[PDB]
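Troubleshooting entry. The earlier prediction with CU4 gave an output that would not parse, so I re-checked the input for stray whitespace and re-submitted. Clean input:
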Amino acid sequence: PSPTPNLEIKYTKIFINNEWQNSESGRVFPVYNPATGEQVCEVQEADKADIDKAVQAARLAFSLGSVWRRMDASERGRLLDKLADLVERDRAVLATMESLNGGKPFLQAFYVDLQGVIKTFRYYAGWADKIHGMTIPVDGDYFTFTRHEPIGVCGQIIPWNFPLLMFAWKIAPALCCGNTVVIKPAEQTPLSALYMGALIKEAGFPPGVINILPGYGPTAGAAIASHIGIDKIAFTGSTEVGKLIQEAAGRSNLKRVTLELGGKSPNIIFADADLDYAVEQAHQGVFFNQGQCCTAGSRIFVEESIYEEFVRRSVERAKRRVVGSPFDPTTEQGPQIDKKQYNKILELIQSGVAEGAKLECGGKGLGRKGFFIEPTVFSNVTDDMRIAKEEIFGPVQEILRFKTMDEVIERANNSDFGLVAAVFTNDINKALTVSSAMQAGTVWINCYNALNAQSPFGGFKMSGNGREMGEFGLREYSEVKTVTVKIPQKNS
Amino acid sequence: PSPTPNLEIKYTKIFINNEWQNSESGRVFPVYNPATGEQVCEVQEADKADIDKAVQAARLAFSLGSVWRRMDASERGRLLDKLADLVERDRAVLATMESLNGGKPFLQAFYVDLQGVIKTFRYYAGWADKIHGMTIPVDGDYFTFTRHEPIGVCGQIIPWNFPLLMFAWKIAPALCCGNTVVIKPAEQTPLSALYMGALIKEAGFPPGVINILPGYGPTAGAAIASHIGIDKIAFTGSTEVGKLIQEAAGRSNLKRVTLELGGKSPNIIFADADLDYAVEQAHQGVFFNQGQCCTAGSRIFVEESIYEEFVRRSVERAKRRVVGSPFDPTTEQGPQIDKKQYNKILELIQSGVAEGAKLECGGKGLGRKGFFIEPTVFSNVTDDMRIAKEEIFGPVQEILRFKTMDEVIERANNSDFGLVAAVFTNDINKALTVSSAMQAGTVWINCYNALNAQSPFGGFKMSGNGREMGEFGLREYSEVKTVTVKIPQKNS
Amino acid sequence: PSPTPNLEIKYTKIFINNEWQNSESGRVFPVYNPATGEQVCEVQEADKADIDKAVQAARLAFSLGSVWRRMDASERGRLLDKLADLVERDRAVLATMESLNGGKPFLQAFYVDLQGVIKTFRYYAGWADKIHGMTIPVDGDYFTFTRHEPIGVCGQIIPWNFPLLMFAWKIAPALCCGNTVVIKPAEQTPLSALYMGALIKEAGFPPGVINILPGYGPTAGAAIASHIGIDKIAFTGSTEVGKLIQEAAGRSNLKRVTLELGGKSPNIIFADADLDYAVEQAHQGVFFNQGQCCTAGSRIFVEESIYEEFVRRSVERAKRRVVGSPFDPTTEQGPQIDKKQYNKILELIQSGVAEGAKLECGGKGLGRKGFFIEPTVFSNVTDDMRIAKEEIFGPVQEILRFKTMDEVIERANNSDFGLVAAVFTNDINKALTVSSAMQAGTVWINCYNALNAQSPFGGFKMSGNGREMGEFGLREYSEVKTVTVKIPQKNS
Amino acid sequence: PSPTPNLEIKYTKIFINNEWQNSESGRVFPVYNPATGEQVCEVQEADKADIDKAVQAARLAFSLGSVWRRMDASERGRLLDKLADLVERDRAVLATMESLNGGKPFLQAFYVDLQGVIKTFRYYAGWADKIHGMTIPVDGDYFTFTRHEPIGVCGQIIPWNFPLLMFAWKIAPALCCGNTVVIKPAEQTPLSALYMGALIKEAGFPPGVINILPGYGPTAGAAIASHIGIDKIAFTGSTEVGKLIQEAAGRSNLKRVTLELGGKSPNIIFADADLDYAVEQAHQGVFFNQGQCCTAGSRIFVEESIYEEFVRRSVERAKRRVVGSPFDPTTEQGPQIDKKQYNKILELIQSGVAEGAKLECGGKGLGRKGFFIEPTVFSNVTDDMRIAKEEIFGPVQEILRFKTMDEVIERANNSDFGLVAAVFTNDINKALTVSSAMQAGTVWINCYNALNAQSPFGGFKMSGNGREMGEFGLREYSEVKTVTVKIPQKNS
Ligand SMILES: CS(=O)(=O)c1ccc(-c2nn(-c3ccc(C#N)cc3)cc2C(=O)Nc2cccc(F)c2)cc1
Ligand SMILES: CS(=O)(=O)c1ccc(-c2nn(-c3ccc(C#N)cc3)cc2C(=O)Nc2cccc(F)c2)cc1
């Protein structure tokens, strides 16, 4: 498969009540190609004026007697299935948008990102009419049962590293439970989300059920975060910004909050692991999606006996990593998202050099246009170094060394982040000892980034609150109502 | 049974690491008898220095490979079953200690409060080894499972409405999941919790698993909220302080938060019901626990056919409600908790007379000695009156009128709270339409505040976040960890 | 919608390994139009020889490393969704087949049976990747989890009253869990099942996963019931044959057994109920699909206060019930399935007149061709009469009177059949009383025949073993394997 | 703990309605200690007349509105926890009378059989109030929920090799769900079950909730199977009788059947495991309880590299096992249950020495101090010997040899039995591939026989139907009833 030639950007307006609207201020903002820097198009810039309108529509679409509220639970699933069909039909167009907007390699956005989007919508389409309450045997002459209802208007804010995928992970479980959505995609990458508005209208969702508002964080985002008519907010996923999301939630109307924040995920490589397999898996664990994943990956602990051999082949693998244009089927790594990310990475690269880390390869930017960075590897990294803490959303792999399994566990847990961990060993005792001792929401054994629509995802400690994906992602978007009836009889 | 004669307050210290301690400052605050104003005793006053030492004890008792961690989950239940036995043994003392401290009648404290305290422990004693994760059939050659691990150190702040019940409702699920507890009772009523520390040590819980710290809210409670070493705060109290708890969690720790806030809960009485049963149940929905209940039936909606009849028996019975010492067996209504709330119950009962509301009996007090307030009935209330919109933690009963069911549904959900609602009818259709239409976490049909260890609670909107009790109460003290293992084949 | 004009019966051979085979004996058997008595086509007759080939085809398709065993669970759902897509395209053809071969009125086969067929496949298409095991916190240093694996080859026998719907109800849950199927439709109505064989091959199901063998009971059915290579049997039909299935299973290989055996389901009409609603619903619960429903409300208990006028309204409703050709849109009632059922109904109608029942209307066969019978009503049918005890599969309504809820509860339960119940009342206490105090797998309140893909349904006593549909239908097609790992330290 | 000195069998009569009765015939049957051959006491011999009397008692205690029905589910749990207390109190008495009757070493019966009994009662004491149904979101104006209700009278037939452990594993889940029980202990060892009848009436269970009917299989056991007043049967015994049980059930009233038939469980041991640990767990895998376990533990495969070192340390441990009297503390092996069981395994011991298999030790006995067969170790056994395929419930170890993981999985699955498996290895991929490829209900990794109260236990293939001893054990004793109510409007 190949990218769409030229490709027209048809959808650049605000999506409210299934109509394309201009911004109330008339303003727009540009969207760039991170591989070249060219301005790709311009998008309506939503502000508090537009956010209030979408909440108004989402509230009306959620009132009793509404088509969305009345709709059979199985029919909410059929709409999700219909949406997944339109995404598969336009799988090549949406993958091209993700490449042009996010700098992701095309074949990556086609076989990974778009695959996850389709499978997420298909998975949650099956959960619609299977969200069960319970009947409970309470003391006394009572009949007590439990109803799971939708909370209401759900404001959602998603980031730029996985634009379409995060868009799916946010709306699929929320619609599955019958909520209405007001979602703001990242200002850098709003194109794939706006195209989703066209498919949503094509699938037949009632008006106002899904309202997409592109705009900036301090404007549209802060309007959502403190809106008194919004009942639940879901944010992804900077740990710093997430502090204010949960700050404005409590100061406004006490929304229920879900967070999917960052992490400095460790990756333990015991000496008794498939060496050729571990070096490639730890490399893809760091360098996938230009290092722009919350599930990196940065801290790689390797046992000393195989440390110098692991470092050697990791450097060989990093040097041959093909960095180039996203539309090229040989490219493995695209550019970074923007200049601010590009600057912050090179700063963090220079901090490691100025602190005793061995720069084995790379170290600076690539080319003159866009935001390409060399695949770089820092050796002899210690726990106190600046690059040891501080997540680096870039292609920088950092290899540490360790003795004793008890030491690597204490160090890998010695962190305020607890999103993800990965251990590589062939001893079942070592694998289950570490995985049960890790303070992380997802722990992979002999793999990395093994994500799926069936397995829940989310971090420990300051890596987020609540879990997405799987059945446990449905618990974020429901509200338990208990009903107790006085019974004359009461029998078993 | 009979109140314990000449009972001394043996435990007035601070419970850290299964030991009694003084304030690091040496400060001390007094506890009062609201039926009399007498100073009961003096308790140590904890603060940031003492809270820090409680977190250190709780963090060590939660350490990997601790006694509390390696312990079989089944013995976690037998430890909680043992606590229930000690409470059952010392039942008369605790009901006495709750009567002298909280101002509740001894027999109600004996038959209601402690019956629920005992049941809550025995209930969660069985859940301890029945906390289940899941193995997920997932795409690709993988084997994915989850394990429900305890979050960690849990800070808990309970009010004075039910000093012992709220204490049990908090620590029972937390310890059942395997957490450590840094709990802070209310300033007015910290004694029943301090005796529990003795039973806790007597039962055999390892030192540090439960830390009881009496003190002031803005002094000790804020130290729990802002402590970077606490993984989760669970708060029950006023809605305004719950917003700060929400804000204090985002400003510092991003800890998981469970709030349980105010009420102002509707009580819909239909014409086809039993007036004799509905009058008394609605009367006990207001005046139970001296009107100091988050689930108090504030607004009563009576059908137009039977309203003036409803008020007649209501006011009639409300003149027979005995208000006396909480130790006389005939007494049903004790005193209000203290002077700040005593004056507040009256400033708003003045607002009722000041507005179009029509008083039908009481409204002043008794002189007496403590903080006793007359059983007051109001009538011909309108929806916009301040009193039909202010959470009154006092024995005042406001009785409205309604015509159609569609009107009473809109008038009931028109409030920012949403903890509780109740319907009284014999019609199957009216009982089910109204019960589903309400926006509350708990809906009763032909009963009121019939709670149990089973079934969750609750509830909606600005009244709380999450649910205690039932199975779902456990979900707020667990932590879901996903483990994915690469497998060579994957069959089935 | 209109029936397909002159319909080709294209698929009349045995379906094994996604191929069309002739009978090893070379025999064929005829299929008849129950409304005209004329022959429709000839079908290959499956015997013990053909059953043997199907078993080894289904056994081979279930072997480790096969396509069906290694396929993602989500893809087993994709194939089920595609199968539902192919049914909705050929919805008019299959409804024509079922109307032609079963005597059902066309519009009712199009809007009820075919709707349930589609909704069933869609519902179970979602369950595939959502069948979860559990992780259990057991005593000692262990890690215990559970997998739900498919049982293996499932033999299934379905009746003739809902040929297509029973076909979907049986193969959807079995395929959802990953089993292979050997299914034998009733000899009277094998055609729509054989057309499903073509859709299965078109949908892309691997060969041998589904095998359809049309034939007779003592030949095809008996060979399935006693096959040593078949792991589970699922029979739906008469209670008499249900005893032989559970017997042959014990004599062969102790294969698991599911039974749906029907019964004599009561319908209780209280004077508190909507009379005109209950008259119409209870008349639908007796006469639906020519009275050939296992859930038929054969015994209608009516309160004496409204007995004589409920009876009269029912007689008027029966006298205007339109009987005619299944292809005519005005027809509500078609013919019975064959001469054997036709005679059994006419003999039971004679027993009612003999034992002293008031034949209020109808009671004799209508016309010369086909197997049409007049709508029939009885009265004062005391519990000892034969029509009150024996299950009638015909358009015969039987009305009893009662005096007390406690009396009608005991009378309705006095039966070896406990499949389905129904109470009509507007009081919630009476609705809770009967529904909880009855021995029936499904209790409908103020409705009848409200079947879903989401609700279980099954027998209590001699009316079946286990359930189908809902979540609980899946547990009858899954083996639970427990895996326990000795782990080093174990930290709960 | 020492065995009770001169214990007298106080309880010798049949237990019906919490009363001791004699047999309706007056016939009695003698019970023997197989470690002395001397007759110990005489027990009333139950038969059809006594079985009919117990069913009528069991049916009345289950009738609607009874004490057992109306009783709160949580108090059903308190009654179970009370039984566990009395068992731990009379722990010594129940221990010695299990060694006197069953013939097991006293400290084994004290620290194994009794530990399992107390944990089983206390594990199911918590499940009683936590059996939940579910509310279903179905299509249309309906509200659908399910209730998990007890089936009714349940007949149980435990074997002789774990009289008290099987007694708890049977009645605890049944009573947990609210059933009534008619249980028949083994004719070889009925005494400890009879004492439990005293502890039952001591604990306070209503009369008739549990009835103990000591007798013979072909006499009283068959009266349970063929009784039309019993809604469900649970066997546990030999595969041959279990086939007859499902025939007697299908021939009568279609009662639900769950069997625990046991068989030839394999045990794989790879060369990368600790030999000290592997040979010891393999010894106790087939030598525990004098080899009279369903698991067993029979076919022990060993990799080539360590086979002739495995047998060296095995025959060391075999001739080191101190056989003797059950009361001697230094005794590890006891006597077989009786002479016919003693006679069949010697008939099979010669069916290896004569079938070409090599013997390593034992193979005779030690006199006639009882029915003692000395620790015997085989070697060089092939798969199609009568020894490696049949019912050797004695202390016979069968050490096989295998080469490839693929080969031993075929050779281990090649069995009509397959109740349990076990694999010893440190390789993560080996332990995962083998454990998933096994056709067994329980498979252990680096352990054996590690049964716990929390984990379900059952059999695959022909040993056979149903699961017990977990959450899923509850499913076996509950009936699912669906309740659907027509509501005025959806709103979902
Ligand atoms: C959240 S709350 O602080 O607002 C509150 C509200 C109501 C009650 C309450 N109230 N009553 C009550 C009793 C009698 C009458 C009368 N006449 C009126 C009310 C009973 C309860 C109650 O929870 N029981 C209970 C029972 C079993 C287990 C358990 F854990 C708790 C307690 C606290
Ligand atoms: C179904 S069965 O009749 O085939 C059978 C099989 C194994 C055992 C068994 N065996 N052992 C065992 C003990 C020691 C040694 C040694 N050395 C070897 C095996 C322990 C058990 C056992 O169930 N424990 C248990 C523990 C806690 C709770 C509970 F509910 C059950 C019992 C019956």
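This one parsed fine. Chain D is about 35% helix and 15% strand.
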